[PDB]
Amino acid sequence: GSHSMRYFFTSVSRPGRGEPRFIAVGYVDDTQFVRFDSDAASQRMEPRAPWIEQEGPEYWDGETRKVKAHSQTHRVDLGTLRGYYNQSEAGSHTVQRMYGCDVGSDWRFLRGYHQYAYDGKDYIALKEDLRSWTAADMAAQTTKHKWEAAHVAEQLRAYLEGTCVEWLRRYLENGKETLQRTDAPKTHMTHHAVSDHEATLRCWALSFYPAEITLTWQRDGEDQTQDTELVETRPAGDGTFQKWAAVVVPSGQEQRYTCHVQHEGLPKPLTLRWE
């Protein structure tokens, strides 16, 4: 019954092709609810879930003002990081920021986070105490010194423990039909010969929410993790998720193999069998 609110920012430079493109998205759990795209015509924070549409004009104006301000700072950051790393303008670079808060089943604060990456690598992250920073290299130590002297952590901690949690709870209530639901996976296994002597066994989970799930194969009760092909959990497009796991086995041995599904929607974990 645990929940999260997260915001994700990506800014990408495009040398000699204009200013950087900035995209921001916001999620409650695995449900997107807002977006902003600096290239788009509207120049507005836009709704992406039905339950956020009821927020009033002060909300949309304020969310737009804040995200535009972040768009500009991440533009400046791409410049700053080229300076920190002595990089040229021959190539494109990427800054990412992610932040948000988690609450438990009882909706009380669990933990907060705020992390930044440059070119796909950790750059600087707020520690669990929300008071101190982890800087991944020497350039990020420069940022750490500046953020310590500017008391950035204190600002974030007040947001993460306060405002973040309060608005997460508001969204959970307003979007309760979507966000408080659990859709248990509909499960089955498929069998297809790959030759006269081997078969692919594929364990499916469909139509589930939230996206967290575990699918595993056992052979006589022993986990077959090195022999399993496990695909990334994927969106169906309707607010639910899908996932599969496959093993290739000698024909005749199917009854040794079982698939095991764990999900919060299931009253008990399922074991699927070939007998």
Add this chain to the structure above:
Amino acid sequence: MIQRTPKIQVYSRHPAENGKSNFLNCYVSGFHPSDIEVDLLKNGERIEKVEHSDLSFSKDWSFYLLYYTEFTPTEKDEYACRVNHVTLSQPKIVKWDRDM
């Protein structure tokens, strides 16, 4: 610089039934940097008006996008997704296999 290859999956929203409207998805995940070309193909031709999700990323900083279109499967029509990215030396085509 870090580069991570897209993991490409092509699939329908619902179990396919010929003559019944559905959605064809191409989900690309796990990639870096974010610049990526994704097309859905019907009988080898690019499908126009394909929509996509807003750019987002996972705990490990790698990106994901869903490209999708409404479609009605038939016996004869072949569907695929074509993806290009800096990590791919040529565009990669994954065929929709409805019997997985």
Add this chain to the structure above:
Amino acid sequence: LGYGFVNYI
């Protein structure tokens, strides 16, 4: 609701 203070790397 997003945070509203800004900072630079």
